[PDB]
């Protein structure tokens, strides 16, 4: 019968669009997740904390060593830890069916990821979590266990399966976790829109809204 907790849900279409992102430089490798959508990769801005890394993108449909990331057109969601990267024409695109929306206080979320195997990928899903908005920011708190490496993993509503955000932050001592929410009309405004792209974008933490957080970088 109907009960407190939601029943079985299919997260596989989300998992099919999750990518591994490696930004490699002399003496440092940034390893995060991303979300593919058409010719676009959606990632954290902090993937590009370090300039001029060689970017490798692993997907269910191939592995793409795009090399120097500074040549790529990018579109930041200004004020929050999300960036959209446009791939070259020779990068085979993802489908364009995922739904994105802002979270609400009705939502609970599961983290979704992917494992890469020889002939296939497999889907991974976490326990569901309550969420709490961090005032004057795009950050929402969640309680799902994460390791360094899991930034960029989608947080998915168990109400309607929409992607609400991607993992971003952890507290430096108490282990609290935070994801960054997608804005309203994200696909229409950032993906479908022909304008607003550039190659000369550089990461600046000061351009993200922090509210009462102090970022330790």
């Amino acid at each position: 019968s109907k009960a407190l907790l939601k029943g079985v849900r299919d997260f596989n279409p989300i998992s099919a669009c999750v990518c591994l992102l490696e930004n490699s430089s002399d003496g440092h490798s940034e390893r995060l997740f991303g979300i593919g959508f058409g010719p676009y990769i959606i990632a954290n801005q902090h993937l590009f904390r370090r300039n001029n890394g060689e970017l490798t993108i692993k997907t269910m449909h191939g592995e793409f060593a795009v090399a120097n990331s500074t040549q790529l057109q990018m579109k930041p969601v200004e004020g929050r830890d999300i960036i959209v990267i446009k791939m070259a024409k020779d990068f085979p695109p993802f489908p364009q069916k995922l739904k994105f929306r802002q979270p609400t206080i009705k939502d609970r979320v599961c983290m979704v990821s992917t494992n890469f195997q020889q002939k296939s990928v497999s889907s991974l899903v976490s326990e569901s979590s309550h969420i709490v908005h961090k005032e004057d920011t795009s950050f929402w708190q969640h309680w799902i266990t994460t390791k360094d490496g899991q930034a960029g993993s989608p947080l998915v509503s168990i109400i309607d399966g929409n992607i609400l955000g991607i993992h971003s932050l952890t507290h430096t001592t108490n282990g609290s976790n935070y994801f960054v929410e997608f804005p309203e009309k994200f696909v229409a405004t950032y993906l479908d829109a022909a304008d607003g792209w550039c190659k000369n974008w550089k990461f600046n933490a000061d351009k993200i809204s922090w509210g009462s957080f102090t970022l330790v970088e």
Partner: peptide, 7 residues
Amino acid sequence: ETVRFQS
């Protein structure tokens, strides 16, 4: 308070 990118 004090936070870091999880990367």
